[PDB]
């Protein structure tokens, strides 16, 4: 069985995957840039395969519909054989681990609070005790699911708040959440994964801040279909890249080396 | 094939596994206490197996002799079938991943610097540039191997320093390293995993401090023999315990709830 080009599924999400400014002049994988573009190339180099970057059709990370039992997002593309590997800020979770294979984490993170500078909030407990400062999450993904499924008193109270708050505290994209923080004069706080919070804190106009400790401790993993032979090699590649210091260099490149906030 | 009692290998290392003060009055698993004792019980409860805690014979975590190609430590006990699972502060590394299976991490950590309070050191770079303040690691394990194998200029210089420094800067146990920091009047700094550094910082006589950022970003994993059926279940149990908040509660219990330094 001859080797085939590996189909990678990913998602447009700065700074992980972005279309280059001059992408119309380019073709194939060269149209894209970012942390996960660089990571894909490093993994392919170490493992010795050719690959094609593709963008997940439905714009989702991965969840199972309770009624149809169908998996959507990048997880679904792996489950149904439409892609060979997912390389994205994809959180390792129990229900996802049951249906796909994950590498050991290439990045550690946790849920965190983004505020407009000057907002009198220091913690999740602070948020949970009040309603003047509205707060919410993406309307899809592991951050929302954290609150929806939590049995911890503070986070379950926060979820009950989010479901019943008006106007809706949910956002469709990271950009919408960040924009809402920036335009709401301190009256909206955004719950999001800490590494995204850190990235935005170093972007103009430098008006946001990460506050408080993380609410949990999770990781992003490279995902493959359950039992795929590619899985073992890619996991070893992640560990090698981490042990060589290259993952730390990649985060510095896309987060801090060109930070815009001094 | 009837079920059998699961043989767990672990290692005496505070606060992960300790013999209880009254252990002579007790028997079996009840002789022991600590973070990994509690974790083993939680994993066994979720997975529905009985188990026996045993202490690794050679007191090592796991490495392969370059000449004989024999694996020692807890990794060796798994490789050669002497134990079914290792539950310990065992770092997930590439060479270990090649021969045993690892769960996703139950704890995140990195190499860090422990100083006696008042030592004029803030970073690994600070240490690397001088010799008046001696510095070293355990004489076995992943922290030592980090320096021995590093191709990063600062850490390779530190390793060349450690090999050639007199008297020997290596220690046999965590307790020896901590004691050496405490007795050396600021002239010894100890390189060790960050969660151990954090634990000791909250122990009397409250004379040590963790300084600087971590040098790397790694995780501890539950280990099983390659291909063991127990591996999948235990990995799902780790993810469940993390998602329920129980791993965070376990760290707080053994690190901070009874911290001795205010
Ligand atoms: N990592 C999440 C998706 N996701 C992401 C971000 C966030 O803040 N929350 C969230 O749930 C910033 S990049 C992706 C998942 O795998 O579902
Ligand atoms: N986790 C290491 C062993 N190990 C440990 C500690 C440390 O500081 N360095 C180190 O290498 C404090 S508990 C165990 C390993 O798996 O080899
Ligand atoms: Cl092809
Ligand atoms: Cl038995």
UniProtKB/Swiss-Prot annotation, chains A, B:
Q: Name one GO cellular component term.
A: external side of plasma membrane
Which residues are tagged as glycosylated in the record? 3
Q: Which UniProt keywords apply?
A: Cell membrane, Disulfide bond, Glycoprotein, Ion channel, Ion transport, Ligand-gated ion channel, Lipoprotein, Membrane, Palmitate, Phosphoprotein, Postsynaptic cell membrane, Receptor, Signal, Synapse, Transmembrane, Transmembrane helix, Transport, Ubl conjugation
Q: How is it modified after translation?
A: Palmitoylated. Depalmitoylated upon L-glutamate stimulation.
Q: What induces it?
A: Down-regulated in the pyramidal cell layer of CA1 in the hippocampus by global ischemia.
A GO molecular function annotation here is: cytoskeletal protein binding
Q: Where does L-glutamate bind?
A: 89, 91, 96, 142-143, 193
Q: Which residues lie on this side of the membrane: Extracellular?
A: 120-262
Q: What is the effect of changing residue 242 to D?
A: Increases rate of desensitization
Q: Summarize the subunit comment.
A: Homotetramer or heterotetramer of pore-forming glutamate receptor subunits. Tetramers may be formed by the dimerization of dimers. May interact with MPP4. Forms a ternary complex with GRIP1 and CSPG4. Interacts with ATAD1 in an ATP-dependent manner. ATAD1-catalyzed ATP hydrolysis disrupts binding to ATAD1 and to GRIP1 and leads to AMPAR complex disassembly. Interacts with GRIP2. Interacts with GRIP1. Interacts with NSF via its C-terminus. Interacts with CACNG2, PICK1 and GRIP2. Interacts with GRIA1 and SYNDIG1. Part of a complex containing GRIA2, NSF and NAPA and/or NAPB.
Q: What is known of its domains?
A: The M4 transmembrane segment mediates tetramerization and is required for cell surface expression.
Q: What is this protein called?
A: Glutamate receptor 2
Name of the coding gene: Gria2
Boundaries of the shown chain within the full protein: 413 to 795 of 883
């Amino acid at each position: 069985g001859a080797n085939k080009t590996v189909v990678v599924t990913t998602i447009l999400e700065s700074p992980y995957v972005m279309m280059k400014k001059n992408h119309e002049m380019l073709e194939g994988n060269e149209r894209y840039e970012g942390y996960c573009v660089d990571l894909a190339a490093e993994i392919a180099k170490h493992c010795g395969f050719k690959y094609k970057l593709t963008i997940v059709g439905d714009g989702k990370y991965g969840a199972r519909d309770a009624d149809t039992k169908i998996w959507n997002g990048m997880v679904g593309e792996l489950v149904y054989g439409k892609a060979d590997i997912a390389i994205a800020p994809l959180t390792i979770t129990l229900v996802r681990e049951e249906v796909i294979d994950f590498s050991k984490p290439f990045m550690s993170l946790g849920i965190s609070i983004m505020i407009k500078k000057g907002t009198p909030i220091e913690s999740a407990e602070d948020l949970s005790k009040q309603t003047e400062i509205a707060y919410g999450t993406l309307d899809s993904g592991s951050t929302k699911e954290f609150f929806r499924r939590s049995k911890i008193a503070v986070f379950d109270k926060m979820w009950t708040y989010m479901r019943s708050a008006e106007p809706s505290v949910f956002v469709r994209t990271t950009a919408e959440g960040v924009a809402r923080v920036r335009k709401s004069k301190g009256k909206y706080a955004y719950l999001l994964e800490s590494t995204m919070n850190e990235y935005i804190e170093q972007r103009k106009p430098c008006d946001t801040m990460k506050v408080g400790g993380n609410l949990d401790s999770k990781g992003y993993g490279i995902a493959t279909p359950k039992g795929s032979s590619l899985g073992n090699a890619v996991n070893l590649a992640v560990l090698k890249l981490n042990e060589q210091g290259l993952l730390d260099k990649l985060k510095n490149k896309w987060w801090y080396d060109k930070g815009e906030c001094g």
